[PDB]
């Protein structure tokens, strides 16, 4: 079922339970936005590794009515006791990632529950009780597991053994395997307190000071006044032209939409379809190419709130040019190194250029 | 990462890319509530100084990218990937393959991918011939001898002309296009 037609509605989703949720809404009615709802809380479930009420997101909705393009950005926040030099140690190290990675630190104030009422409010058609159900169920009778989620649980069964998903995830011991019934009792009855409650209960309520409670277990400072805290925002996208297309993507505190448009306005002038797909002369390109953007995101990207981004001299026309100089047939480019975006934009940054250490 | 999109009767379109981080996030589950906690906050910078340190209140850099693609000012194409960081690459290298090559969305999609942030990471999909990935190499690249898969786009092409969706979803996860009959 990898590709599908359909006249009033589809649906595209990494579980195939969490496609069939979400084409349901529609047939029983349901928008999109309505359908995007069910979907995110079926994949908590489903696909649980991945994403969910524990995280956060960029929704990007075109609304029909209006003609707008809106993101909703549920992006999680630090907590007020996050600092600067948190992932560093005692000597000023780094620490390493397996370590931090598993650490109280890392754990941002979640927002995506936040999101899908702010998207609700705004598009929402049905009750989010009938959002919210089909994913209750999941989670209370349980489903057999698709190979990503048990290759998931086996890759990552040392850290899944040091915390309370030892027992859900790891029982008597050992990981669920491929067809294996997952029934998440506790996740359960999250969704029937948040189905009668709202998100009071997530922000303002017991499900997040029990959040806070586990996060300070596991060394971190988030505090039940993070969780009060925490509202979404929404975005307008950061628009780009491609090949006679107007392309709209996601603008900082993704790096993603202006990296994007960015390596597709440098490998233009190359008419890269020349080239075959699999050949020597196009895979080329595009590795010089991403060199390029990707050390002007290590340089240049961060929470705009923050910091200033210079998205109109990454993509200025005439900073575009001058880094198509690097990019070459001739040979492999060696000075890999941040372009000067700021020439083309007004201002100056405010934050140093910081090497980071590739060990993600 | 998880990407998804969906497109109803009435026009709206939407592309959604969410996450907890790392798979299971830190691995922390909530006692009692069954919910894991996300390790977002490491997509921070860990040495401070730069546009991506860490700061109270802040939000750290992602790399998600979904996106809208647009001809005559109306929705065309949704696209989006998870894959931290490779995320960019899986996106540009899709919208390259459908409107610069003129591929099918699914020839798109499953084209082999690569990725390279720097001169001592590189990544690509299994599909890249033996003899071009030893030339490259040899040009000063540095692709490994094992093929990973990159990404899992899931995207929906609007087609007016044949007043018709159609969905696709990746083969590196099981996901599936599901349409809907008024
Ligand atoms: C799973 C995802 O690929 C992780 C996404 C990464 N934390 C990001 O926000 O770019
Ligand atoms: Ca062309
Ligand atoms: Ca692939």
Request: aromatic content about 8%; overall charge negative; glycine content about 10%.
């Amino acid at each position: 079922d990898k590709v599908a037609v359909g006249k009033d509605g589809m649906v595209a989703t990494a579980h195939p339970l969490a496609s069939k949720i979400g084409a349901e809404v529609l047939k029983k009615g349901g928008n999109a936005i309505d359908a995007a709802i069910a979907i995110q809380y079926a994949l908590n479930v489903t696909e649980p590794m991945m994403s969910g009420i524990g995280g956060g997101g960029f929704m990007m909705v075109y609304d029909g009515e209006t003609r707008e393009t809106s993101i909703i950005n549920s992006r999680e926040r630090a907590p007020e006791g996050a600092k600067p030099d948190m992932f560093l140690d005692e000597d000023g190290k780094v620490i390493p990632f397996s370590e931090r990675s598993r650490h109280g630190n890392a754990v941002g104030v979640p927002g995506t529950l936040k999101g899908l009422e702010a998207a609700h409010k705004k598009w929402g058609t049905k009750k989010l009780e009938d959002l919210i159900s089909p994913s209750i169920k999941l989670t209370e009778e349980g489903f057999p597991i698709d190979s990503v989620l048990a290759d998931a649980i086996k890759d990552h069964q040392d850290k899944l053994s040091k915390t309370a998903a030892k027992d859900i995830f790891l029982p008597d011991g050992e990981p669920l395997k491929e067809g294996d019934i997952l029934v998440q009792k506790d996740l359960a009855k999250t969704f029937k307190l948040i189905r009668k409650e709202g998100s009071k209960a997530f922000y303002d309520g017991e499900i997040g000071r029990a959040i806070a409670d586990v996060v300070q277990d596991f060394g971190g400072s988030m505090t039940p006044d993070d969780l009060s805290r925490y509202e979404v925002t929404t975005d307008k996208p950061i628009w780009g032209e491609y090949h006679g297309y107007d392309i709209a993507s996601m603008p900082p505190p993704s790096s993603g939409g202006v990296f994007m448009l960015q390596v597709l306005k440098l490998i233009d002038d190359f008419h890269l379809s020349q080239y075959d797909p699999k050949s020597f002369e196009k895979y080329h390109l595009l590795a010089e190419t991403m060199h390029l953007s990707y050390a002007d995101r290590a340089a240049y990207a961060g929470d705009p709130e923050f910091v200033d981004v210079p998205l109109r001299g990454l993509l200025d026309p005439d900073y575009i040019k001058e880094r198509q100089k690097l990019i070459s047939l001739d040979s492999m480019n060696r000075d890999v190194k941040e372009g000067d975006p700021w020439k083309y934009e007004e201002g100056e940054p405010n934050y140093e250029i910081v090497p980071q250490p590739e060990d993600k | 990462t998880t990407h998804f999109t969906v497109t109803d009767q009435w026009g709206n379109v939407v592309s959604y890319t969410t996450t907890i981080e790392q798979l299971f996030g830190t691995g922390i589950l909530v006692p009692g509530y069954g919910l894991f906690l996300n390790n977002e906050l490491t997509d921070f910078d860990a040495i401070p100084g730069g546009a991506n340190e860490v700061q109270p209140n802040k939000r750290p850099l992602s790399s998600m990218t979904p996106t809208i693609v647009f001809k005559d000012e109306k929705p065309v194409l949704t696209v989006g990937s998870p894959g931290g960081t490779t995320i960019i690459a899986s996106v540009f290298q899709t919208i390259l393959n459908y409107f610069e090559y003129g591929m099918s969305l699914q020839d798109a999609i499953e084209e082999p991918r690569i990725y390279t942030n720097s001169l001592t990471s590189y990544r690509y999909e299994s599909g890249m011939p033996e003899d071009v990935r030893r030339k490259l190499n040899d040009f000063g690249h540095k692709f490994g001898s094992n093929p990973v898969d990159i990404g899992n786009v899931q995207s929906i092409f609007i087609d007016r002309e044949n007043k018709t969706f159609m969905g696709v979803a990746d083969s590196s996860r099981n996901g599936t296009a599901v349409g809907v009959n008024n």
